Structure 1
Amino acid sequence: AMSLENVAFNVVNKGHFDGQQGEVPVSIINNTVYTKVDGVDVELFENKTTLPVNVAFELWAKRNIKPVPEVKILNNLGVDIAANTVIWDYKRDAPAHISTIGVCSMTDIAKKPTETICAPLTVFFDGRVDGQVDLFRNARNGVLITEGSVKGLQPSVGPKQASLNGVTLIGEAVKTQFNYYKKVDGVVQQLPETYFTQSRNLQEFKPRSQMEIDFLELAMDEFIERYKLEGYAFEHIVYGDFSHSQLGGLHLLIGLAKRFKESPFELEDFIPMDSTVKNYFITDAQTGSSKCVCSVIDLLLDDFVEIIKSQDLSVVSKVVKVTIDYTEISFMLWCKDGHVETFYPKLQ
């Protein structure tokens, strides 16, 4: 019994779509959904998607309000569609997937993920919903998340953090660390050994290790001494070189966060989307040092130190592949006389 007026009633009264009966008067003007509240129009939704305004409104109302995997993880695992839910991409202000299964009549390719149209697609299954672990078992392609153990299936421990209504957090009142399972052409995959990005903000950056606490509190030369990082170019890669017109290094989010406490800078997110590696056009406000494409990754400083210290420093230029968020991230490693010159997530 789906309608625009019922989706709007649910938004107004329940904060989101909750399957409740009722209708509120709605008006659609351009890309905005309004509702009449005491004779005046109140904005309910501004469409930032490439879908029709009323269709995007319904998918946003029908979004998953439980902690879900971050869109970058789902993309890295090859998820095409979700089973009977909408994973809302809060970085793009749009649905994470083109089509739905049992969600919205306009976007639905099927009502149940058992339909033969879903067989070639990697369907996302949520073990927290009844029957979805069995639906994954029967599906040809899919990704499954669970809070606990699945009989006979070997798990992949995912990241500590998940997205709850666009807030990335490590849950204390809710579980955010999931077990991951993947099936390709009916065969359960052995998910690779992986590092995870920490998904922190520059504004509210918090250290998650004694090494990260020491990076933010110590001076550059004290930290590099304490952690035996001489010859690993942390001055360039992590701290950043602001002495020339082209900003040197600055590829770790912790280094950007440290810089941010002292002086501000403009980070232009020219491709605004969730990804393991982010690219910014950075302009340092203090010096005027800038870089059009400054690739930034948020790895735990210990994990980045482990990666850089596990590389052969005998070649001038070399690609270093690292599994991060289940995807293969290529890095460019540049050395001279057995010491690191630069190390950065490889641009195109």
Structure 2
Amino acid sequence: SSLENVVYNLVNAGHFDGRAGELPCAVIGEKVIAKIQNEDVVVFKNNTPFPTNVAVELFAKRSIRPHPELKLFRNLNIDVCWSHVLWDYAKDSVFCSSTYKVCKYTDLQCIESLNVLFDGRDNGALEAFKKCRNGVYINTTKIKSLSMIKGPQRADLNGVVVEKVGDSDVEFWFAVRKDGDDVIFSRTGSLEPSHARGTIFTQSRLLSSFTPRSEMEKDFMDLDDDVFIAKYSLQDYAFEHVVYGSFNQKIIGGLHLLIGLARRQQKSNLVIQEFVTYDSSIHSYLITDENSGSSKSVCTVIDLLLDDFVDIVKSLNLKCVSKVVNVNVDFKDFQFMLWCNEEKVMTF
């Protein structure tokens, strides 16, 4: 596919349809300029590591169908996508640094040993998957002839996090291969050995539009701290610190759960700076609280349904000093630091 055809597709279909046609173009720095009706208009701005003309081709070929949130693939260590490209709207670039059977200039000649993502919706994906050394195969339908594990009920659709598709619940099943063998999933046990059932998933909410998803989260947003803690008997779980956060010192204390930041935002502006910006299970922020003038340089934050967080804390018989509990979130084992006075997610 040529630049002119790609731009023609982007302008008339919003993405690459494979349709014929051409639009006069000009590449200037990270700008792609198309001449439309004798007028020059910027149709693409390159914020990727690729050459500008190559970047617009990759964006035009981006997947416009719903797919599992990218943080899951990162957690599964996906290296390249088989015959499709995923656009990371938070990152404002492509997901993988390389492609396969997608773009001539960027396609890898060899992916034998890389971790390949195969989407059941692409023709030949399953056959390619069964022959790969390392990979992940996803499908919206549970396949009885494959050992699979279900992902959470939410997808990335054109960068929008949705819980339904066509007004129907989102459903994604996962199959995995490593070193030539299928990973066999059973109903019980932990996904990884000591060093966790794989059912805990982050909620994917944004601070600017956070919304309670249960009655407990609803109370946490409306009731005073004292009231909330007693109602759900969270006595010795130090929520004041870990979840509510303390703003009476130069350095913010706790504040590791997204809903906690959401609650603070109700009475005080929280400004967040993020250095590595892309969909991830655990985020690392430089946080500044306006009202108090308090702040912290590396404040790890995770968006867990509060109900899920409490079950995690009540499962710990905190009666051990410097712990290092492992919690499997979004299919990956994350180590949470647990002093008998704090439960914070660590930087991984």
TM-score between the two structures when normalised by the length of structure 2: 0.93
CA–CA distance in 2 between the matches of 1:259 and 1:135? 49
Q: Which amino acid aligns with 1:61?
A: A
Query: What number of residue pairs does the alignment pair up?
Result: 336
CA–CA distance in 1 between the matches of 2:263 and 2:132? 46
Tell me the SS of whatever aligns to 2:84.
coil
Q: Could you say which residue in structure 2 is the equivalent of 1:114?
A: none
Tell me the SS of whatever aligns to 1:196.
coil
CA–CA distance in 1 between the matches of 2:26 and 2:291? 48
Q: Which amino acid aligns with 1:285?
A: E
Q: Could you say which residue in structure 2 is the equivalent of 1:338?
A: none
CA–CA distance in 2 between the matches of 1:74 and 1:274? 10
For 1:314, which of 319, 325, 333 is the aligned residue? 319
- Runs of 4+ in structure 1 displaced over 3 angstroms? none
Q: In the TM superposition, what are the counterparts of 1:90-105 in structure 2 within 5 Å? A: 90-105=89-104
Q: In the TM superposition, what are the counterparts of 1:154-303 in structure 2 within 5 Å? A: 154-173=147-166, 176-190=170-184, 192=191, 193-194=197-198, 195-303=200-308
Matched, 1:71 2:70: yes
Residue 40 of structure 1 and its aligned partner are, at CA, apart by 2.3
Give yes or no for contact 2:147–2:183 (8 Å, CA) kept in 1.
no
Matched, 1:120 2:110: no
Residue 321 of structure 1 and its aligned partner are, at CA, apart by 1.0
Tell me the SS of whatever aligns to 1:245.
coil
Matched, 1:131 2:101: no
The percentage of aligned residue pairs carrying the same residue is: 47
Q: Could you say which residue in structure 2 is the equivalent of 1:304?
A: 309
Give yes or no for contact 1:147–1:175 (8 Å, CA) kept in 2.
no
CA–CA distance in 1 between the matches of 2:211 and 2:175? 30
| Residues 113-136 of structure 1: CA deviation (Å, up to 9, x unaligned) | xxxx22211111111233322322
Q: Could you say which residue in structure 2 is the equivalent of 1:46?
A: 45
Matched, 1:9 2:16: no
For 1:144, which of 134, 137, 140 is the aligned residue? 137
CA–CA distance in 1 between the matches of 2:28 and 2:39? 14
Residue 249 of structure 1 and its aligned partner are, at CA, apart by 0.6
Give yes or no for contact 2:338–2:344 (8 Å, CA) kept in 1.
yes
Q: Could you say which residue in structure 2 is the equivalent of 1:343?
A: 343
Tell me the SS of whatever aligns to 1:262.
coil
Residue 175 of structure 1 and its aligned partner are, at CA, apart by 5.5
Distance change >3 Å, CA 223–CA 156, structure 1 → 2: same
CA–CA distance in 2 between the matches of 1:253 and 1:316? 26
| Residues 196-217 of structure 1: CA deviation (Å, up to 9, x unaligned) | 1111001111122221122112
Give yes or no for contact 2:141–2:171 (8 Å, CA) kept in 1.
no
TM-score between the two structures when normalised by the length of structure 1: 0.93
Distance change >3 Å, CA 329–CA 59, structure 1 → 2: same
Q: Could you say which residue in structure 2 is the equivalent of 1:113?
A: none
Residue 39 of structure 1 and its aligned partner are, at CA, apart by 2.5
Q: Could you say which residue in structure 1 is the equivalent of 2:194?
A: none
Q: Could you say which residue in structure 1 is the equivalent of 2:59?
A: 60
Q: Which amino acid aligns with 2:28?
A: I
CA–CA distance in 2 between the matches of 1:271 and 1:147? 30
Q: Could you say which residue in structure 2 is the equivalent of 1:106?
A: 105
CA–CA distance in 2 between the matches of 1:30 and 1:148? 44
Q: Which amino acid aligns with 2:241?
A: H
Tell me the SS of whatever aligns to 1:328.
strand
Tell me the SS of whatever aligns to 2:170.
coil
Tell me the SS of whatever aligns to 2:164.
coil
Structure 2: any 5+ residue segments left out of the alignment? 186-190, 192-196
Distance change >3 Å, CA 332–CA 209, structure 1 → 2: same
| Residues 60-81 of structure 1: CA deviation (Å, up to 9, x unaligned) | 1100000112111001112111
Matched, 1:89 2:82: no
CA–CA distance in 2 between the matches of 1:172 and 1:124? 21
Structure 1: any 5+ residue segments left out of the alignment? 111-116, 336-340
CA–CA distance in 2 between the matches of 1:190 and 1:162? 24
Tell me the SS of whatever aligns to 1:60.
helix
Q: Which amino acid aligns with 1:181?
A: A
**Which deviates the most, 16-25 or 144-153?**
144-153
Distance change >3 Å, CA 294–CA 169, structure 1 → 2: same
Tell me the SS of whatever aligns to 2:55.
helix
Q: How well do the aligned residues superpose, as a CA RMSD in angstroms?
A: 1.4
Give yes or no for contact 2:83–2:122 (8 Å, CA) kept in 1.
no
Q: Could you say which residue in structure 2 is the equivalent of 1:153?
A: 146
Tell me the SS of whatever aligns to 1:231.
helix
Residue 50 of structure 1 and its aligned partner are, at CA, apart by 1.1
Q: Could you say which residue in structure 2 is the equivalent of 1:324?
A: 329
